[model samples]
Every structure is written in structure tokens, then in C-alpha cells.
Target: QPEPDMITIFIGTWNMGNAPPPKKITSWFLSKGQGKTRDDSADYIPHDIYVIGTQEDPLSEKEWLEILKHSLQEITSVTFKTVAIHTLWNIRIVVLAKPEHENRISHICTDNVKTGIANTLGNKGAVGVSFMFNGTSLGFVNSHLTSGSEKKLRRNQNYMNILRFLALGDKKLSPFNITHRFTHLFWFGDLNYRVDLPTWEAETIIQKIKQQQYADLLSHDQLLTERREQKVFLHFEEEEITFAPTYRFERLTRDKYAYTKQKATGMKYNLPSWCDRVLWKSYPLVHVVCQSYGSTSDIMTSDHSPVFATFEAGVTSQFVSKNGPGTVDSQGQIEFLRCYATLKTKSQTKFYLEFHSSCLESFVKSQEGENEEGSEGELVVKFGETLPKLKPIISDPEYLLDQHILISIKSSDSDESYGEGCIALRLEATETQLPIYTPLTHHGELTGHFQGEIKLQTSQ
Candidate 1:
């Protein structure tokens, strides 16, 4: 009998300080003796998945992707492909996977939330990408939060805002809570947490770090203190730090901390802190082990050094039998669901029907293209008329229960609201056809009646 399997994933985060792409990034991507010394004889191994996040990126989308793709191809076998990429102004996240695991990934979606001034700008916020891999779902969020060391409360609020506002996909298809939707999740970036020490103690801390004694300094870490107080990152886990602080490095230098001389007599600087970090959360029954966590200092193009973590994830693989009916093929063809509706209202009005189904990418509005005058409003269906033909929507054969198609009735010209109803598809029963009849109600008052049936449509 065969045993369960695990895959390796490499996760990295960096704050570029709005700097341009470096000449080469192979040392950062491939393992080089980072932070501490190693045997330097172990052969480098490539991971099955790579998730890279960046903050204050200066390159355009095309330029950055090209550089990333080329570097990845040169470093490893050229079998990796960029699966998904999402950006919120300067913040971006990119996911890449090997060819063997590509077919098993689905439901790829992206979303972003702005937490800047007035909570409306994109300068500080998060961008996320989510997908299903085999039987397990995963999510990645890259964020840039409030900066000042004393503004711990603002950073805590930023975390809450991202948890509350960042959604993976359509509201109807995904869970309302972002943390509850995925089996494994990674949240990382320039969080800007600082060390809670007086400026007079900065020299002492640096001296201690030079001696490789980090325990005493780590105790005063703002991120750790807040986590102990249950103020942020409620259930996330981070690997023990075997590396030094990753922020406040002087630009164009390899290992010097940035500081400024004051005319009054003392030298002042931003206290060194582990601002860039990697954190993960996993559901029960899913096993995750962090193999290594460290920061790379060879590439000194930015003020902050890059941090990375490697994980071995054990997941239950999803298998589809060759005889399964709705399975996707090479050409992206698969079984889909189609619905026909018969709607009736009390008064003669121009209304349209909106269909919200689990299988659809977005809600489908009825009565399309009836008016060709390029009017300001929408075209709608008349009372006692049949809905126009609806194109079949793609569906997952694994979805079992609580899958429903919601129907909403709304007035077209007058913008008056009618009501909404839903039709449940018996997917667990594996039935070929299902009939539905539900009453539309607004505030518990009957407004209309709808009758429909949903059936599986095989690919032609």
C-alpha cells in the first residue's frame, strides 16, 4: 500500500524601499549560507511551490514579472509556471508551482484591502491570493502596515482591518471569515514592529547581536509582546529566530546599520528590528513543519534584508477516478449546470432576474441586449415573460451540499426592489435534474413567485 505524501514550499517576503530590481537574485532564491555558517557542501534543492511577497516595489508589473520568471528559470529546472499574481499599488504577491501539481489547483482568486490615510489609499494594506491544492486549500496575504514603533495600537487595528475586509473571492462562494476559509495560510511582509528599548540601550543591543546572543533582545520585541498579550496575530505560528534583525541596514552597504549624526552631540538612528517576517496558520489534521527560517544579506540593494522560510506540508491528496463524469480535461472542458426560470410579478413592470450560483464566476443578469441604444440603465424582462437563455456555468464535481442558486427580482427603469429567493441543488444525491419552486419575499412580504430547474450539461 502507498503512504500519504508531502510537498515542499518556499515562502519569502521583502521590503524593497521603492528600489529597482537587483542585477541578480539567485543567491536569495537558492539557499546560500545566510545569517549563520553552514557545511556549505549540501546540494541545493528546489521546492515544489514558491510564494514571494514584496513591499514598496518600484518596477512595473511587466518588468518585475519578467525578471522574476527569468531568475526562477535559470535557478531551477524550467518546469515552473506562474500560477497567480496580485498587486495593490506597491504591495504584491506571486505564486509559482511545478508542472506536475498544476492540474490539481483550482478556484484561484485574489483580493486587496487599503489601510492607508482615511482607510482609502493603497500605500499601506494587504493583497491576498487563495487557491485549492489537491484536497487542501491555501491562502497567502502580503501586507505593509503602520510604521512608528510607538504606534502599536495602529498596527493592531491594521491587522484587524485586513482580517475583516480582505476576501478571497465572491462573497457567496467563500466563507465570511477569511481565517476560516483555508486549511493553510501565510501572512507576511514589512509589519514594522520594533524593539521596545530606550535609545541609550541601542548600542548595547547591537553589541549583543554581534556576539550572537539574541535571547535578551528578543524578549523586548514588540511583535512578541503583543502576541503574548493577545493583541495581534491570534493563532499564527512563527519559527524560532536563528537570524539577526532584518531592517534598518544602510543602503549600498553589506553589513552596516544606518544611523545619522546629530549636531547636538549624539548619534541617532531607527532602532534595528525584525520588521520583515513570515507567519503561518493551519487547520487540524494538516501538518506543517518549518524546515528553515533566516534572512539573506548578500543582496544589499534595499534598506531591508529579505527573509524566507521553507515548509514541508503534509496534505490529503484529492484523486478523481478515470470514469468520473464532470472531470476537467486537457482543453479545460468540464460538466456545467444550466438553469431555466419562469417568473411572475403582481404588476406590469420591466424587471430583471439576477442568478447567484456557487458554480458561477459572477452573478448573471437576465434580459441582455434588448435595448441597443446604449442607454444609461440596464435591459430587463417584462412581467409574465420567459427569461433569456443562460450560458452554462462551470462547476466542481466535488461540491456536495448546501450549493444553491439565488434569484433576485429588481425593477429596471424605476430602480424599485422586489425580492429574492433561492433554489437548492441536490448535489449529494448525484441527481441529473432538480426542480425548484420558491416564493420571493421582501421583508417577509410576498412580492413574486419563481419556478426553475437546474440540470447538468455535459461538454459538447
Candidate 2:
């Protein structure tokens, strides 16, 4: 079948520090760089722009700018396209897209508010350039929320600012009609909040957006439940399953660096919480799918894992739509019921009930034979040959009379001879279908009464 309207968007965030000095740079760069030149490869570069958003260290900043300049020059040299590098604070905004998509790109915006420690707390946010696909326009904003004391509160405010910009689109302009022209909107970043908690404080921003009618592509109850069960608080949530963790540090030993780097400080690496994510708004013209891949499988250049998703335009469907009767069909219903029956039969309670019935039938027949003289035994054996296994016991006249009296006394508690257990069982079976007692008259005085009813009515 032809595929429906669907696109996958991969959003990733890594703290790529200031570029190291040329001499101190890792050897992978030298060998990989040389190989790319020798092979005249077309796949050396992946993204349209390798933006440097924030650099805390001056040395790293200088190194990153040099690397960015060289990379942009080399990648765009053949295509004759110009790549721009813009910076605010320690953050940089990189833009990359196909030429057709790039041509549709308008202006780019960056919020590099530097409030020193305040910026680290919650002041700074950044967004990539806006581009058009088919007739639909969209953009991506990357952010890292504050961590430490009152992290939840700080992150929440940062998210609000993020949404404000995402909603209004550029601070200088009044509310534009981008909603009509642009069909989809995506806002994704690491917002460092544990969603399993009762408060779900970190997710509050997205929750508010969803209330506004945006579809969180990764939201699913099962996915959230799995994250809670596994104590994995970060990453994507889809259909009750949490996607693989993406951030890993590399300095600690094998024990610590199972996924990636173990040490966070200096050279050691460790897996930090998932601080990156994406949110989206629905559009009639575009479709999207979110995906994650392990870092080892993609690249070893960074300690943190990389994630990406393919976005396609001119699609119409999200999920299969059931419109009318005959959608699933009669055969489908029967097959579904068959599976349900199989599951029911496999249950311990049902299995035990079936086994108990069989055993009870055999035991009751043996006892009936003992109770019956030779004449009755022959009759019983003949009856047993053709009768269904679930038939009742004690059909003979004498036995039935005695059994009826015993059952009556047990039910009415008329004699102390019966134990509590027997009385309980008798009461349970008789209470629903049988009457308790019938009064007997003796002249003018009130006399005795016989326990138990004669007629029994049962329906199946």
C-alpha cells in the first residue's frame, strides 16, 4: 500500500564546548578530514549549518568559530552557496535545509539575552530559521533549561518564554497570519523535568500547548507508563514506551560508560538526563514523525548521542481513519473473539474450574456406585455410558430422600449434628433457588414445619 502523510523530525542537543586548539584536536578529525578530501565524498557534511549556540569558554569559542568557518567554506564551496555564522552569548544558531526548502526560508531569530548567571538560570532561548515546505512553513527552536535549585520553576519560565516566541513568531511584529500560511509548528529542546512525578511540572508547558490543540507527536500513555516503571524520567514518550537515552559522557571506566562517556568533568563521561525534546502543532498540509538513534551507530565525534527524523510535505493522513460499518468486518470480529476465548481458557481460575468439574464427576460416580446395591449400580453404569459428564449425583429414591433431609437440616441449621462448614456450603447452594421452610398446622396450636422446598427452577 502507498504510505500515508507522515514525516519524521529528529531533534538533538549537545554541549559542544569551544573548539580545541588545532594541535590539541583529536586525531579522528585529521584522518576523517583527509579521507573526505581524498575520496571527493559528497556525504562529509550532514546538516545545512553547524551552529555554535553558546560557548562558555573563550578558547573553545575561538576554536569553534575557526572550525565553523572552515566547514562552511568547504561544504558550500562546490555548491557555491553562502553559509552565515551568527552568535549571541555562548549560543549559535545553525541553519540547514535543501535548496528548495532553503529558498523558501525568510529571516532567522535568536534570543541571546546575557544576564550572566541570570542567563544560565532562565533568560536565554534560541530558534532556527523559518523555512517553507510545499506551501507549509515551519521552524525549530533549540533550548536548554536551567538546572539546580528551583530548577523546576526556572525551567517552567524558560518554557513560557520559548512558547511566547514560538506563538507570536518574532518580537517586533504583531500577531502575523503565519497560522494560515504556515501549516505546522515545532518547538523542541531539553527541558530537564521528571514527568512521572504527580505534578508533572516540566511538562506543564507542553500540556498547556496541547490544550491549545497542538499534537505532541511523542505523547502516549503506554510510553509514559513504561518510563515510570523503568524509572526513566526523560526522553520521548510514545504509546507507553520510552525511547532510548541519548546523552552519555565518556571518561569513566567501562562500568560507568556503558552507553557512552562516563565522566562529565574533564575527560570522563556519564549519561545525563534527557534534556532534549520536541513539540508540534497540527497542520492540514504537513505530516511528521519523531525518531531516535544510538550515538555509537551514527558517530563517535561527540560524547552525546545524535537524533534525527525525516520530514515530508504534501501528505494527508496521520492514522488509519475508521469511517463506517464493514470497516473491521464480521470475520475480524470472529477472529478477535477467538483470541479472547483462548485467553480466557488459559486463565488459572478457568482451568481449575474445568479440572474440578471433571474430578468431581468421577468421584461422585464412584460414591454413587458404593451407595447403590447391585441392581442400582448396573442401572447407573448404563446411564453413565450415555449421559453427559456434568449430570447430578444421587438420583435413586432412598438416597435422594435421605440426602434431601440432610440438605434441609444443613440449610436450616435444624440440628447441631451438622458442622459450620457443612451448613455454610448448604446455605450457599440453596439460598438462591430454594425456599427455606413450610409451616404445618395442628388444630388450633402452632405446630412444627419441614425445612426445604420441593420444586426447583433454574435457567441457563
Candidate 3:
């Protein structure tokens, strides 16, 4: 019967269309009207947690992650740490949390299911990351279903397949119902559901969007139609789409839809659709209110604009007391640890290694001074036998040791991947220093080697 703790959450889904990130993503993440202006801080909405999903993201994971890391830093006092990252080919989902809540968040896990061609490829599929934050279980799913206005059934099938097969966590923590498994669940991506109207009429609605006629287009939305029939997203809820349709824009153009006509037959193709979306559902006893739901039109790098929704998510204190048995205080005295490492590689080669777990995702380079101008100031390790330091943000050493840290090496310039391996921090070593001498391979053959040791340091 205790009062629930409410925290702000921001969730966004975008179909990048295999395009690189544009110059600024501020508009997509932060809005002017959602939060109060600060006389001492930047005018923005600072969400405690951020869940971002992208489809057709062609950039290297490090490159994309670096951009996101910078964008989240626009806020003043609140620092963000990427707690979970899951990628299925081009579809990616990331979960980030503030320093105050990282330790309280537990039971973190990730899973992916491919529904692409022959059910073997990752071209079209879903990747999800789930965790419990302050006694509230939450799941975030990013998916890319089949595209085409006539493919509504296929998209529904994809959604069902994802829900059926995408199991996360272990033992009792494993989900019973993917849709209703968590206290709150968020699913967003290039669902590719379109309007039922023909291309000509859809374009006509687009023209009247400025006149507040977006409701006309929403009336024919295939997603809404399927939901009304209880075919897909059976109990999911989405904030009303007051913005324009988010798909079929001309690539690299700001305001133009990709409406084209055949010269010979004058047949039109590429109907504007509300393909990208953000939707969520909350269970009883927990409250979730969508504060803002809209799409960013300034991002013109892709054919679909990015869509975002901000929510005031509530977590129950009863669950917290039940989970801990005797723990009555809301915040635990948790000490955060920063992981530092020194990776040894060939001095002549420029290398990038990504180390990740449910609580951390970090990219470290071999050389530090090479590109210091505008980069996100990534951690760097000198390519030699010495234990050069590699800096990553705060994490719980015990949690990290319980989870395997997946590491992969790649060329800095060409992005040609080298070897990949997984390591768990040895509990015997009080210093927590372990050598990382793994065989670097490419195309099933040994190409080089990495010799280094990672050190865990305590942070405030």
C-alpha cells in the first residue's frame, strides 16, 4: 500500500533506412514543451531512462553508439549509462539508465528472434532487452516486420512470432507472456503498417496535414484496423498520433514524400504510411502515462522520420519490499565501479574493441591521440604489452562479474572484424586484473592477437 515512485522514461523508434546518423538528434530525444525550462540548464526534457530502437541501421555498432552517447549528454547533472544493448542484424535496441537507478535495476537479459527469409536470416526480426527497475519489470522490443501496404497480415504474423519465441531471463524470471510479462512493455520499430487508402488519396491527406487533417489519415491506419480486430498488439496502447505520418519521405529530403509516378503508365508507388511507431502497455497496480507522442521532422537522413514518446512510469513500492524481504529504504547504498583495461595489439594497426554486458556497453580504441578533435572522447588503450588504461562509465563489479562480458575487435578504419570472445571477471582476484590474450581471427583464420588485462576501479 506504499506510494509508488514515478520516473520519466523516453522511448524512440526510427527506421534509419541504412543511413548514417545526422548532425543533430537533439530534436528527437529532447523536446521544448515536455519539460520546464531551466535558468541554469539547457531547455530540454531529461528522462531518467531511455530506450531507443533502430531499424535498417547500417553503421557499425560503435559508430552508432557513440552518437547516442553524445546526444544523451546534453542534459546537465544526469549522466546516462547504456545498461543493455541487443542487435539483430540491422535492428538494434538499447536501454540506458541514470546513475541513481542502475543498481536497483536487475534481472537484465537480452534475446532475439529472426523472422526473415526462411526464418534463418536476421534481415527482418526483433531484438529485445528486459530488466527490473525499482521492483518494476520492463521490456523493450525493437522489430522490423515485412513491408508493403498489403502485408498487414505478414506483419501480424511477425509480431506473434516474436512474442512466442522471444524468451528472456532465466528460471523464474523467464517471461510467461511476452506482451504482459512485465509491469510495462514497450515495442517500437519499423512495423511497416500502412494506411488502407490508395496512394493518391493518402497523398491527398498528406497535403491537408497542415490544416489539422491528420486524423483523416489515421482513420485508415492498418495498425489501428488490426488492433481493433485484435490481430496484433492485442492490448498495447499508443498515444494518439497528432503528428503527420512518419514514412515514405524522399531520402535526404526534409519535407517531401517519396511519391513517384511511372512515366509510361502513370501508376503511383510509395504511399505515405505510419510505419515507425512507439507503443506500450502497463499492468495493473503500476501506472504509465504518455506525456508526449510525436515524430521529429528535422531528421531527413532517411525515408521515415523518427518517432518518440515520453512517459511518466510508476514502480510500486510493495514489490520492492516483497523482493528484498527486509529492505525498506528505496535507495540502496551501492558503489559503482568503472572498468579500465589495456589491450595489446599490433602497433601499426588501428583497432576498436567493444566490450558489453547488461550493465555496460563501451568502445575502446588502440590509439588515443589520433582523432581527438570531435569524437566522444572514447577510452583508448596503447597497442603494446603495457597495461594502458581504458576508461568506461560506472557499473557494478559484482553484477558485471555475474554476467559475461562479450568483446569483439575490429579495424578502426575499414571496420573489418577481427576476433570475438567472452570473459567473466574472476572472483578470486581481489585486484580484478586479468590478462586478455585472445586470438584475433578473421574469416575463420587467425590474423593477429590481443594481449591485455582489464582492471576494475571503484567510482563514486
Candidate 4:
């Protein structure tokens, strides 16, 4: 097979402290307006995918999604046809791809973890997304890690937790390590990597950041040290960080690092460090070429400066078009509506089902996987006494157009006590495609619900 064109990707991240989104993010993508260098908008064109992430922001996922989609659409690029975004507490990851290249991407999934408290809440965690790009699988993760120089180990654990633990509904990926599952992985956001020297010495290092001497200072960077000695990021790599530090900046000024507070405090100030970062790595068999990497210091809305990078994610001659569920079309629109199936094992009375979209045809169950043309099977899940009326915002172009179905399910069967006779998908239907019956591991008199999602896909 022929080699696929190199996909140009754009990723921007900020921890907004719950502030309102700006009217213009064009500066983040293009250099025409202001902020970075003086380059034409056409200079950085034909971006196959754009991944924009925000952390510690107050805007709801819905609010940011609308504003983000509308603002990006107002600006021009190669051709942005479809969009998908995920939010976990303070973190939000937005992904958009050109329309024609949609089907080459499939097996969509996302997951997050609770790193705060007893690990029960989302005060701190990472939101990640995985998809196939031109037959190459990639995982994009945006995280808000624990702070302080001493907590680097916690940050390291958070990275591994997000990689191994984040769940994406019923349709999941990689029970093994997430790093090895995809061909390439891009992890970005505020990792809180500090300068390992004393607070006094860390302050001096960033002062000489523009000179040749800064390379000697970066030798003490905590993340770099951990990578060298502690084996933190095993195979990961970053573009040469020629730019100055990006964290702890003064909100109003152009290039000034901020004081910790005007406090009669002990240490006097926060050390300037490169906390906001963009790093990626290719699996052993794949390759990625970094085009350009730098921070966009122009948008000064947060204490953490926004950073960006452009790169060519390589695809090999064997990059074949693989097809599966949750795929999109040339217009960047999703083909399937997803619904959750919860099988109740204890009493077997009620199978709860939730749907965000209105077009649920019927639920199907199969005892033997993929062999039965079962029709909603022996169990029936209902939406109360009647189906809830849905005026789905299917036409709202300002929003990401993913057809969603949310549900809680319980199965009430008279004669069926289940085991390997588990709850399974029977090639169900809706706007989804075949093998439509995704399986749920059912066991225990556990009175628990099995999680299953229906996928509807389209091919031209």
C-alpha cells in the first residue's frame, strides 16, 4: 500500500482557573493576529487534527464546547469537519479532524481517574482520548497533576494511573499498559515539573533562559533528571525547549514571572519553571517528526502560560484503512449513537438503559457472542412507563456532533441464572453498525449491572 500523507496536528493547553473562554483562540492556531512570530495564517495550514486542552477551568463542558467549536469554525484551516471533546473535573480535551480522513480513524474511547482524596473524586486527574489515525493508533492525554517539587513521584504515579486506569464507557481499549497499546502517544498539560535546585537557584536559571547558558541550567530540570535516573518517561521525547519557562507568569504583564503572593511569607516567591509542556513518543516500530515546538506567550489569561507545538505524525506504507464502531464521515460527523446497558444480576428485575439520542431502535441480547440475530433478547429495558421525548440538538453546528445515549439497565428474567451465559450484544441496531453487540463481563450474584454500548456507523 501507498504511504499516507503526514498528518499535521496542533495542540494547545491552559489551566484557566474556571474563567470564561476568550472570543478568539485563533492566536493559538495561527500567527497572523498576534502573540508569537509574524507569520502568515496560510503558513501553518492543512492541520489534520487539532487537540486543545484546558485545565482548572470553571466553564462547563457544554459551555466551552459551544464557544470552542464556533470560534474555531470562524477561522479557516484545511477543512475541519467533525469534533469530539471530553471533560473530567477541571480538565477538558477537544479533538477535531478533517472530514474526509474520518473513517481512517475509529475505535474511539476516553477515560479519567480520581487522584484526589481517597481517590473517589475528580479534584485532580487526567482526561485522555484514543483513536486510530490513518491506521496508526494514538493516545492524547491532558492532565492537571499534583503540585510542588517534592510531589514528583505523585505526578509520576498520576501519569501511570491515567495511562492504565482511565475508563471510556463500555467500549474500552488496552487492558495492558496504555503506552504500548498505541503507535504514538502525546501527553500534555501542567505536569508540575520543577527545577531541582534550591528556590533561589531555580529563579536564577530562568533569567538566563534566552542565552546559551540556560542549557546548563536545564541540566537540573526535575523531569529530565527523573527521566535519566528514575526512568519516569521511558521512551517519551519533547521538542528542544528553546523557549523560556511557561509557568507562574504574572497575569497582566507580557513576560514577567509572578511572585507567589504579596505575602510576608518564608520563601518569598514561587520558582519559575517550565510547568506547561508538550511531550510525545512513538512506539518502537513507528516514527514522529517534530516540525516546531514553542509556547504561545500572547494569551495571558492564566498564571500558567499556554503552550503549543506542531508536528508531522508519520504513517507507514502499511497504513491500511481499518473500520470499526464510533467512526465518523467526511463531514466530521459521528455515525453511531451510543446507549448504555446495565444488567441487574441480583433480582434480575430491571435492566436500566440511558440514551442521549432519540433513535434507539431496539435492544438485542445474545447468549453466544456474535452468532445470534437476537431481537432485544429475553430482556426488555424501558425509559420509565414511556420513552422520554427527545428534541436532540442534532443541528447545533456550534456543538460537537456526537450522538449520545445514556442509560441504567436491569435484567428481569424468570428462568435465566447467568454465568458464561453473560449479557451480550446481539448485533443490535439504531444508527450503528454490525458486531453491534458489545459484551459485558457478567458474574456474581452481585446484583450489579453489565455495561454495554450500541454503536452505529456509516460507510460510503
Off by over 4 Å in 2: 1-11, 17-85, 100-102, 107-124, 132-134, 165-182, 194-243, 252-272, 291-303, 314-460
* lDDT tens digits by residue: candidate 2, 347-387: 12211001011101221111111111233221111111221
* Span of 10 residues, lowest total lDDT, candidate 3: 327-336
Task: Give the runs in model 3 whose Cα sits over 4 Å from its true position.
Answer: 1-4, 32-45, 116-122, 173-175, 261-268, 317-460
Expressed as tens digits, the lDDT of each residue in 1-460 for candidate 3 is 3333788888888889888878888777764312221122434546788898999999877887788878888653456788888888899998888777766788898999898566536488899988877646688889899877777888988887887788864334221335535667888899989878876575586677646576777888999989888778865798887777787787776567775655622463657778988888665335688877877767888888888888888763323222133322222211113222232333344555555333332333333222121133332434343222433223334322333344456566666554544444433443455554444333223344445565544321
- For all predicted structures, in order, the TM-scores are 0.66, 0.40, 0.65, 0.62
Best model per TM-score: 1
In candidate 4, how many Å is residue 395 off? 45
Between which residue pairs do clashes occur in model 1? Answer: none
Error of 3 at 282 (Å): 1.2
What is each predicted model's overall lDDT from 0 to 1? 0.68, 0.30, 0.65, 0.56
True lDDT of residue 310, candidate 2: 25
Cα deviation at 342, candidate 4, in Å, is 43
After superposing candidate 1 on the true structure, give the runs of residues whose Cα lies further than 4 Å from its correct spot.
Answer: 1-4, 33-44, 119-122, 169-175, 259-269, 319-460
* lDDT for model 1: 0.68
Per-model root-mean-square deviation over C-alphas: 12.6, 27.1, 19.0, 14.2
Candidate 3 lDDT for residue 341: 28
For TM-score, candidate 2 versus 4, the one ahead is 4
